[model samples]
Target: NSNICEVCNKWGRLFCCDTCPRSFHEHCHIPSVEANKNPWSCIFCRIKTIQERCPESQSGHQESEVLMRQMLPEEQLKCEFLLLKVYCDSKSCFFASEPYYNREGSQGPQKPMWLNKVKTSLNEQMYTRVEGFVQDMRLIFHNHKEFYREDKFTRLGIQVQDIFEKNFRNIFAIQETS
Candidate 1:
C-alpha cells in the first residue's frame, strides 16, 4: 500500500507485494490471477527463468571441504558457528506476543487493552512442523558444510514468511504493554 502504482497517481485496484514492497496495478504486464492467495513476484524483482550450472572448466565442488581440512579442528567449528549465526539471523522478523508470556494469569492486571492482539496464526500443529524444520536445518549445519544448499533454504524461508503474512496482518504495529 505504501508504493504508488506505476499506471496512475490514484490507487485503483492495486496489488501490493509482500516480498519487495512493490505495488502493481491490474493492467500491468504480469497478470494478477489469484496473486493474493499465492506468492507472486513483481516484474521488477522477478528472477530469471534459466540459470547457469557449474561449467566443465571448473574442477571439483569440494572447495569448502578442502578449505576446512586445511584449518584446525577448532578453527573449522568456529567458522561453522559464525556462518550459521549469520545465516539464521540475517532475516529478522517480528513475532506477535503470546498469552502465556503475558501478565494474564493470576499475575496480571486484567485490562483487555494490555492483553491486545497477542494471538498468533501459528497453532500447535503449525508450531510442531516449524520446530521439526528448524531441528533439521540445525542438524544440517552441525553435520556437514557441503550439504548446505542455498535454493532449498531460500524457498523454505519464503514459505515461512508467506505463512505469517497470510495469517497475521499488522505484525509491526505497536500495542499497549504491561
Candidate 2:
C-alpha cells in the first residue's frame, strides 16, 4: 500500500478515509483525526454535509459573472472546496509550495503563483470577482508550463489545469460562451 498523506504528499503512517481515496497524517488533516473514530471520512467526503444544508435554488446555479464579494455563503464554500480539490490532485504537492528555488536562475515568470497563495487570497477576501480567483489558478499552471518548457512537468501542469477548469464549470454550472 502506498501510505501517503494526501495533504503533504509524504509517505508515512496515514489514516485512510473510508469514503474517499484520500489519506492523511493525523496532524496533517484539518480538525485532526482521532484514533477512536473508526471508518473516518476526510474533509472532501464531508463536503456533502455542507451541500445537504444548501438550498437547492442557491446551489450550483451561479452566474459566471458573479462577484466574489457578492457570492452566497454556499458559493464561497464551493470556491474553497475547489481549492482543496486542486491541492489533492496536484502531483507530489508540486504546485502547493513556491517554485522560486526550482527555477533555473530567474528563467521563470516574474509574477509567480502557487496553490497556497490562491488559498490565502481567497481566505483574505482579496478577490473582488470570482474571475480573479480563476485567473490566479490558471496562472499557476501557466507558470509551470513556462518554467518547465515542454517537459513531463509541463504535461502534468496541463492535466491539472484541465481538472481545475472542469471542476470550476461543474461547481458554478457555467455555460460555455461558444
Candidate 3:
C-alpha cells in the first residue's frame, strides 16, 4: 500500500486529517508537528474552524472581543490567523505575527507599536504611559533573554499586541472598527 502526501505530492509517511480527506507530509505542514497530536488537525482545517467560529456577520463586536480575551493564551494564538483578516480586511495593514503590510500602498505611517514612540522630555501624557509599559516589557525580556531568540520574540510580541489591543478597545470604549 502506497500513501501519497497531499502537500508534496510524493510517497512518504502521511498523516490523514479526521475532519477532511487530506493527507500531509511530516514536514510539509506549515506549523510542523513533532509528534501526532490526538484528535490532530491539519493547518487548513484548524484555520477553517477558527474562521467559522468567528464569523464576520456577528454583532456585538466589542462584547465578543472582551469574551475572546478571556480565552487561554494557547487558544488565542490559535485564533490569530482569523484576527489577521479582521485587521487588514484583505488590504494593507500592520501585522505583527506575519508580514507587516503597507498601510498606504506606497507611503504611509508604518509601525503601530508604541514602543518606538517614546521621546525625551516630550511630556506627552499618553506617551509617558506607554513608556512605562515598555519599560516593564523590557525588564521581562531582558530577564528571560534566552526565551526570545530569533522569531520567538516576534511571535510572542504578536500575541502580546493582540491581547493588548482587545483590552484597550474594551477599556477605552472604542469600537473594533474604529
Candidate 4:
C-alpha cells in the first residue's frame, strides 16, 4: 500500500480501497467517494458498474458513428476511468502534473499535455466528441514520447499508451480498423 493517494500521489489522509492496494482521497475518485464508507471498492474494481450502466450496442457498424457523436455520460465515465487506470499503472504522478517548470535543463513539449489537464477538460465537458477526448488523451503520451525520446520515460509512456489503447477498445467496444 502506498503512503500517497494513487490519483494525485500526495501524502495526506487517504481512503484505501478494500479491493486494491491503491489509496485515494475522498474527492479524488470518480462519483466522489463517501468518507465514512467502509469496504469501499475503487473504480478499477467497479467494472461491472460501468459495463452495466453503459451497455454497448450490438452492431459494430456504428462504432465510428458513436465516436463522432457528442460525448455521453457513459462515455465520459469511461474516459475518467481510463485516466484513473493510467494513474494506477504509472510509477508516479510525474505525468499527472505539469513538468515544464520543474525541469530546468531541458525544454518541454511545445504543446504540453498532462493527466490533470485532461481530467479537468472532462469535468468541464470541454470535449464535444469522443474523438476529441481520444485525441487529448493520446496527446499526453505523444508528448511524453517526444520529450523523453528512447529513455525510461519514453518506455513508460509506451506502457501507459498500451494500457490506454487496450482499455479504450474494451470500454468503447471499438474493433480493429484496417
Candidate 5:
C-alpha cells in the first residue's frame, strides 16, 4: 500500500500501528510514533486506555518504582508492561541473576546511572530503596558491552494518552476490570 494518505494527501510517514494495520502519519495518528524508541499503539481498541477512562477504576499498574532491586535475581525476571507486573517469588531467581544496571556505576558519581539511580554508595547490583515509577520498556539498543531500557514514567504517559483519546475524555485513569 502507498504510504501517502489517500484521503488527505499528507506526506510524512507511512507507518502503521504495530497493533493495527491502518496507515497513519506521525501527525495523523500518535505524534510520537516516529523516532520514538518504543512502539506506537493505535488508540482504537486497546485495554490500557479502556481502564483509564472509567471513573471508578482500580489500576493494575505497578505501584513501585522499578529499580535495579526490583529485578528478581532468583525468580523469573519480573517486569511491568503497560503497568502490569510479572515476577516469580523464588529465592532461586536471585542466585542465578546478575542484574547490574551498571557494574561500572560503583566506580563514581560522575556516571549517568549514578545520576539516574541517584545514589553514590549503592552496590552496582542492588536496586534503590525508593523506587520511582514503572513503565513498559523496549530494548533501546544492544551490543557486547552494554544495553539500555527506558524510564517508566514516560511509557505510562503514553498509555494514559491512549486511554483519554479512545474514551473521549479530558483525562484517563486505567483501572482493573475485576
Candidate 6:
C-alpha cells in the first residue's frame, strides 16, 4: 500500500481498482476515494465498453431492461445494474377511411376508417396499428378493458401514463417537513 502504483508509477502510495483490477495511486483516479465499494470495472474500462457498444445497434434486443429503466431518473440510469435503452417500435401512423357514395351520385370526403374500425380489432394484428392510439389509451384507462390489459401478442396493454405519472410524482415529489 506504500510505493509507486504498479499501474501508474508516481505519487507514492498504491491503490487498486476492485472492478477492473487495475493498480493505481489514489490520486490517479478522478473520483475522490470512498470508504467502501467494489467497482466491476475502472471508468476507462467501462467507458471503452460503452463506446464499443452502440445503443441503436442492439435495439429491442433487451426491452424489459429499457422499460424498467424508463421509470428511473436520468442519474439513476447511470448507476450500476441500471441501463437505458430502446423498448419498442418507432413507427408512426394515421387513420384513413374510404369515401361514401350517395344515391345522387355525389361523394363525400373519404374518412380514415382504417383507424376507427380496428378499435374493435385485436391490437396485435393492427399497427400503422392505426385506430387512434389516444382512444385506445382512453379505453384502457377509462373503460378498464380487461382483455387489453396485457396484450403480449400486441405488446399493447393498460394505460401506463397514469402509472408513470403516479410513479414520477411519488418518486420525486417532496413534502414539507418543516
Which predicted model would earn the best TM-score?
A: 4
Q: Please provide, for model 2 over 61-155, each residue's C-alpha lDDT reduced to its tens digit, 9 standing for 90 to 100.
A: 44545544354555556677677667667472778877773655438688899987777787677776677878889899888888888567688
lDDT of 5 by residue, 13-70 (tens): 6666666555555533322235763566643424445445663544333223223334
The global C-alpha lDDT for each of the candidates, from Candidate 1 onward, is 0.32, 0.71, 0.42, 0.74, 0.31, 0.32
Query: Which lDDT tens digits does candidate 4 get at residues 65-152?
Result: 7579687776677677877777666453667787673454556777888878887888798998888888878898888877776567
Measured with C-alpha atoms, the lDDT of residue 177 in candidate 4 is 71
User: What lDDT would candidate 5 get against the real structure?
Assistant: 0.31
| TM-scores for every candidate against the unseen true structure | 0.23, 0.64, 0.32, 0.70, 0.23, 0.24
Poorly placed runs, candidate 1 (over 4 Å):
1-3, 7-9, 33-36, 48-178
lDDT for 148 in candidate 6 is: 30
Task: Between candidates 4 and 6, name the one with more favorable TM-score.
Answer: 4
Model 6 misplacement above 4 A: 1-8, 52-178
| lDDT, candidate 6, at 133 | 31
- lDDT at 42 for candidate 1? 51
lDDT per residue as tens, model 6, 98-165: 22333343333233233224323322333222122333333433322232334342232232334422
What is candidate 3's lDDT per residue for 17-104, written digit by digit as tens? 7777777676454344448577787655776665577665233445444443433433333333223222322111222223332433
Name every residue pair that clashes in candidate 1: none
Worst 10 residues of 6 by lDDT: 83-92
- Winning model by lDDT: 4
Error of 5 at 176 (Å): 22
